[PDB]
Design a binder for this molecule. Sequence first.
Ligand SMILES: O=C(O)/C(S)=C\c1ccc(Cl)cc1
Ligand SMILES: O=C(O)/C(S)=C\c1ccc(Cl)cc1
Ligand SMILES: [Ca+2]
Ligand SMILES: [Ca+2]
Ligand SMILES: [Ca+2]
Ligand SMILES: [Ca+2]
Ligand SMILES: [Ca+2]
Ligand SMILES: [Ca+2]
Ligand SMILES: [Ca+2]
Ligand SMILES: [Ca+2]
Lengths: 173, 173
Amino acid sequence: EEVRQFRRLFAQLAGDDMEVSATELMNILNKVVTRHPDLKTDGFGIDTCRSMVAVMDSDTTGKLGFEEFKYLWNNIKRWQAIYKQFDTDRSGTICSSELPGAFEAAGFHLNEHLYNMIIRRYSDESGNMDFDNFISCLVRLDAMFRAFKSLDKDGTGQIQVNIQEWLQLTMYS
Amino acid sequence: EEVRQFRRLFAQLAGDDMEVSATELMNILNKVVTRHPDLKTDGFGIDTCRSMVAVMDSDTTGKLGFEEFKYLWNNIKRWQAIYKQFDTDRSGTICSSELPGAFEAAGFHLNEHLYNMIIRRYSDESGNMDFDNFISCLVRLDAMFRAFKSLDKDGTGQIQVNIQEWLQLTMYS
Ligand SMILES: O=C(O)/C(S)=C\c1ccc(Cl)cc1
Ligand SMILES: O=C(O)/C(S)=C\c1ccc(Cl)cc1
Ligand SMILES: [Ca+2]
Ligand SMILES: [Ca+2]
Ligand SMILES: [Ca+2]
Ligand SMILES: [Ca+2]
Ligand SMILES: [Ca+2]
Ligand SMILES: [Ca+2]
Ligand SMILES: [Ca+2]
Ligand SMILES: [Ca+2]
């Protein structure tokens, strides 16, 4: 009864409006990381969770319905496993050297330039990335892959994006 | 002596590497808003300030040099004055009703669907937006418009990108 127990997880987490808000997501995540001492974090901030919710909120209800949440949560579960696997010095954080292997293992094969860009945006002055920043980066990276894929109808490797779609994809995220 | 003084602030804030990090930006932003009770805020969070740095970091030092900082700073001061001006309610926050005047006065004219996304992503359940969310929203919007315009010089309203570029545009940010 796994999908049962997951259905229970969602229902109790979503509460009275049956959708998962930025705050409810923030709270469950902080609650869960608390039990994983191998994962260092300063915590999931509200801003970060609003951004994770918008980027998963396919129907734009402001909040995460069952499928949108299930997709997010199944990814976080695989990604968490990967972070542990690739923290091979047990700093509880992913440094620049560990990051490629980790992201590849989640199925994003980026080049050097991009790996650097990501380190610049999401890692600290030491080149170290803690767990909330890794999850947040990955959720967005995956959404941006998926959004490109949707727009490349013809499979040319190029998308045309109008300003309305651009603003929608960049501001609601 | 507006120039002298602004160069002196910059120097003292930027410290020994002569650039403003996300953390230095965070601290001066929270220091400043304290002396402005009318700008209601739960504080500028480090996440929000890394995003602010990233979107303004044109030379990709990972940090804001003098010009990059001055440019961000001057927008913040302008938008800050717009925030009070359009908080005609004087609640210290911007509600869904005051929002479009504020954005119109920052020169952004957006359709209703975009407004709804932005209210959803930046405002609380009362439809109120506080100062750090506001500034964070506009620094992002302004950047996203400058990104797109930069790539669509002759106002076709469309850009064409491959995945590398799209990831640069949407993840560095
Ligand atoms: O947290 C859980 O209850 C489950 S079943 C998997 C899991 C482990 C770690 C994180 Cl951060 C999220 C989910
Ligand atoms: O910070 C300043 O020196 C001035 S003049 C205006 C101002 C007020 C609030 C913020 Cl957050 C930034 C600038
Ligand atoms: Ca709920
Ligand atoms: Ca939704
Ligand atoms: Ca490590
Ligand atoms: Ca963090
Ligand atoms: Ca500095
Ligand atoms: Ca810079
Ligand atoms: Ca108001
Ligand atoms: Ca806020």
